[PDB]
Design a protein around this motif. Structure first.
Motif, PDB file in Angstrom:
ATOM      1  N   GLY A 171     -30.366  12.783   3.531  1.00 52.85           N
ATOM      2  CA  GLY A 171     -29.933  13.944   4.280  1.00 52.85           C
ATOM      3  C   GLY A 171     -29.066  13.608   5.462  1.00 52.85           C
ATOM      4  N   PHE A 172     -28.930  12.309   5.794  1.00 48.84           N
ATOM      5  CA  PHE A 172     -28.174  11.936   7.000  1.00 48.84           C
ATOM      6  C   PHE A 172     -26.669  11.900   6.735  1.00 48.84           C
ATOM      7  CE2 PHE A 172     -31.822   9.110   8.909  1.00 48.84           C
ATOM      8  CZ  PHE A 172     -32.643  10.274   9.010  1.00 48.84           C
ATOM      9  N   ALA A 173     -25.912  12.055   7.821  1.00 51.32           N
ATOM     10  CA  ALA A 173     -24.483  11.836   7.810  1.00 51.32           C
ATOM     11  C   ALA A 173     -24.176  10.494   8.463  1.00 51.32           C
ATOM     12  CB  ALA A 173     -23.749  13.009   8.548  1.00 51.32           C
ATOM     13  N   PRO A 174     -23.442   9.610   7.757  1.00 51.55           N
ATOM     14  CA  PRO A 174     -23.024   8.312   8.330  1.00 51.55           C
ATOM     15  C   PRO A 174     -22.347   8.412   9.711  1.00 51.55           C
ATOM     16  CG  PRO A 174     -22.576   8.344   5.983  1.00 51.55           C
ATOM     17  CD  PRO A 174     -23.011   9.758   6.342  1.00 51.55           C
ATOM     18  N   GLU A 175     -21.578   9.475   9.950  1.00 52.69           N
ATOM     19  CA  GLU A 175     -20.841   9.560  11.207  1.00 52.69           C
ATOM     20  C   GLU A 175     -21.685  10.070  12.383  1.00 52.69           C
ATOM     21  OE1 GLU A 175     -20.222  11.070   8.347  1.00 52.69           O
ATOM     22  OE2 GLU A 175     -19.100  12.929   8.622  1.00 52.69           O
ATOM     23  N   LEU A 176     -22.895  10.566  12.126  1.00 56.73           N
ATOM     24  CA  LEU A 176     -23.704  11.109  13.247  1.00 56.73           C
ATOM     25  C   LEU A 176     -24.796  10.132  13.692  1.00 56.73           C
ATOM     26  CD1 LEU A 176     -24.322  14.784  11.961  1.00 56.73           C
ATOM     27  CD2 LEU A 176     -22.440  13.963  13.355  1.00 56.73           C
ATOM     28  N   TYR A 177     -25.031  10.081  15.008  1.00 57.63           N
ATOM     29  CA  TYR A 177     -26.188   9.346  15.542  1.00 57.63           C
ATOM     30  C   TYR A 177     -26.228   7.904  15.006  1.00 57.63           C
ATOM     31  CZ  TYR A 177     -27.437  14.069  17.032  1.00 57.63           C
ATOM     32  OH  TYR A 177     -27.430  15.310  17.618  1.00 57.63           O
ATOM     33  N   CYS A 178     -27.386   7.465  14.486  1.00 53.31           N
ATOM     34  CA  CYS A 178     -27.508   6.077  13.981  1.00 53.31           C
ATOM     35  C   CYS A 178     -27.107   5.953  12.496  1.00 53.31           C
ATOM     36  CB  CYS A 178     -28.940   5.538  14.184  1.00 53.31           C
ATOM     37  SG  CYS A 178     -29.354   5.524  15.965  1.00 53.31           S
ATOM     38  N   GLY A 179     -26.318   6.909  12.013  1.00 53.80           N
ATOM     39  CA  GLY A 179     -25.756   6.840  10.666  1.00 53.80           C
ATOM     40  C   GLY A 179     -26.826   6.973   9.608  1.00 53.80           C
ATOM     41  N   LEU A 180     -26.891   6.003   8.673  1.00 57.32           N
ATOM     42  CA  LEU A 180     -27.906   6.080   7.613  1.00 57.32           C
ATOM     43  C   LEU A 180     -29.258   5.410   7.967  1.00 57.32           C
ATOM     44  CD1 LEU A 180     -25.659   6.028   4.460  1.00 57.32           C
ATOM     45  CD2 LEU A 180     -26.511   8.005   5.826  1.00 57.32           C
ATOM     46  N   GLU A 181     -29.433   5.071   9.255  1.00 57.66           N
ATOM     47  CA  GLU A 181     -30.742   4.712   9.786  1.00 57.66           C
ATOM     48  C   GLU A 181     -31.214   5.793  10.701  1.00 57.66           C
ATOM     49  OE1 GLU A 181     -29.268   0.737  11.180  1.00 57.66           O
ATOM     50  OE2 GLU A 181     -31.404   0.250  10.787  1.00 57.66           O
TER      51      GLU A 181
END
Ligand SMILES: [Cl-]
Length: 101
Positions: free
Chosen positions: A4-14
């Motif tokens: 559900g994460f976006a790579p460009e936001l926050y810590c990306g895929l972590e």
């Protein structure tokens, strides 16, 4: 769930809590700062001699610093927690991330 994460936001895929090995449910700023300072020390490029390894250390250090910036700031953390909880609200989550910055 990092799908559900976006790579460009926050810590990306972590997940930023996982990056600092802190627990969302047992969070406080004292624990967060201690975790950041230890991991920042561990991944600091001054700790390694060669140029190529210093770049790799800087690469990781950037994530550590992003996790701390996201979680230490009350507004960013409230936005972050909402994003974790509401991955389908794409426009809202992107807007809140970019608005704050
Ligand atoms: Cl990523």
């Amino acid at each position: 769930n990092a799908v559900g994460f976006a790579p460009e936001l926050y810590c990306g895929l972590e997940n930023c809590y996982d990056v600092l090995e802190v627990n969302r449910e047992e969070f406080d700023k004292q624990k967060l700062a201690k975790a950041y300072r230890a991991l920042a020390r561990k991944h600091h490029p001054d700790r390694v001699k060669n140029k190529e390894e210093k770049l790799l250390a800087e690469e990781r250090f950037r994530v550590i610093a992003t996790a701390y910036e996201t979680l230490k700031d009350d507004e960013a953390k409230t936005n972050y927690d909402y994003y974790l909880d509401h991955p389908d609200q794409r426009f809202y989550n992107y807007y809140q991330y970019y608005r704050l910055r």
